[PDB]
Ligand binder design. Structure first.
Ligand code: BOG
Length: 330
């Protein structure tokens, strides 16, 4: 058991092993720290008030379980988790240590005009990671430029798994449960923006957002209208005149036609037909990066705990168990 020291930053006290030095406020709260053990810079996150409620405590537990499970070059992972508490009874603080990422994809599309090769590399990395996330049975559900860390070498990690601008339309319809392809929709929106320097669907609210989407992909085939239980949703789609399905070729003139085709296959209104991460990784557009022997899948992931109402002390105790059972990587 390590040596802890204490420190006031911004407004909050931090008690962390001595192994971590020069804590510097970045973003729970996030300090950047020097891992004296590895020489590497890392991020130390102090969860806010981890066991403030049933909702907070289950989330804390969920966040710990997720991060413990994620072992892939393109998905945020856990370097360490600790707590100053020395018993279950003391336990009120949780810290997570991860690679210091320092820039997001927003800081990348916003202050540049990326080339085609750059978009192949970034998107390929999203999809490689997403394949691993999906093969665990996890849907991420909030993929957007700000949940993607991109280091100075253009290496990418997916952050925060399990803005309306990237949300699959079926989510905006509420829709009684949906599938992994809700993520492929997001990816298609991210790609479009990488290529164009423009937000694809900068909807003003959830209604507008549907309009903007329809402008591009066209009003649903009767075979898709057939699947919408909601009459008011039905009505609104059939209202606002039947819209002209655009040619992606014109919306994306100048883009590599391979990029354009792939977009067409991602931004399909019917999540059934939307291309999957596994598939998209084999699309020609990625021919320079693809390698089926280096696109691993995840060990299956236990999320049965999502289907239960437990007490705070129960979520707390399970979280305590996970901290203590953490085994670090190489
Ligand atoms: C703007 C109008 C929105 C177009 C309809 C969204 C199509 C989403 O697709 C639908 O998603 C559902 C949720 O998984 C599935 O149950 C259906 O099989 C699938 O076709």
């Amino acid at each position: 058991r390590p040596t802890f020291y204490r420190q006031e930053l911004n407004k909050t006290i931090w008690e962390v092993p001595e192994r971590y030095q020069n804590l510097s406020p970045v973003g729970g709260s996030v300090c950047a720290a020097f891992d004296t053990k590895t020489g590497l810079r890392v991020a130390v996150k102090k969860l806010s008030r981890p066991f403030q409620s049933i909702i907070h405590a289950k989330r804390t537990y969920r966040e710990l379980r997720l991060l413990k499970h994620m072992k892939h070059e393109n998905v945020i992972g856990l370097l360490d988790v600790f707590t100053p508490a020395r018993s279950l009874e003391e336990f009120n603080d949780v810290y997570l240590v991860t690679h210091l990422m320092g820039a997001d994809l927003n800081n990348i599309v916003k202050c540049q005009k990326l080339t085609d090769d750059h978009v192949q590399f970034l998107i390929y990395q999203i999809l490689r990671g997403l394949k691993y996330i999906h093969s665990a049975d996890i849907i991420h559900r909030d993929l957007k430029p700000s949940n993607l860390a991109v280091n100075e070498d253009c290496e990418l990690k997916i952050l925060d798994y399990g803005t309306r601008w990237y949300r699959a339309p079926e989510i905006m319809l509420n829709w009684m449960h949906y599938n992994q392809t809700v993520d492929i929709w997001s990816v298609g929106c991210i790609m479009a923006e990488l290529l164009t320097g423009r937000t694809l669907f900068p909807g003003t609210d959830h209604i507008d957002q549907l309009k903007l989407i329809l402008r591009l992909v066209g009003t649903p085939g009767a075979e898709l209208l057939k699947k919408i239980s909601s009459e008011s949703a039905r009505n609104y789609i059939q209202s606002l005149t039947q819209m002209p399905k655009m040619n992606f070729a014109n919306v994306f003139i100048g883009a590599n036609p391979l990029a354009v085709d792939l977009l067409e296959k991602m931004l399909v209104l019917d999540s059934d037909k939307r291309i999957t991460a596994a598939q998209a990784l084999a699309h020609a557009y990625f021919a320079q990066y693809h390698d089926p022997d280096d696109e691993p899948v995840a060990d299956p992931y236990d999320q049965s705990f999502e289907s239960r109402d437990l007490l705070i002390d129960e979520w707390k105790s399970l979280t305590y168990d996970e901290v203590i059972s953490f085994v670090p990587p190489p």
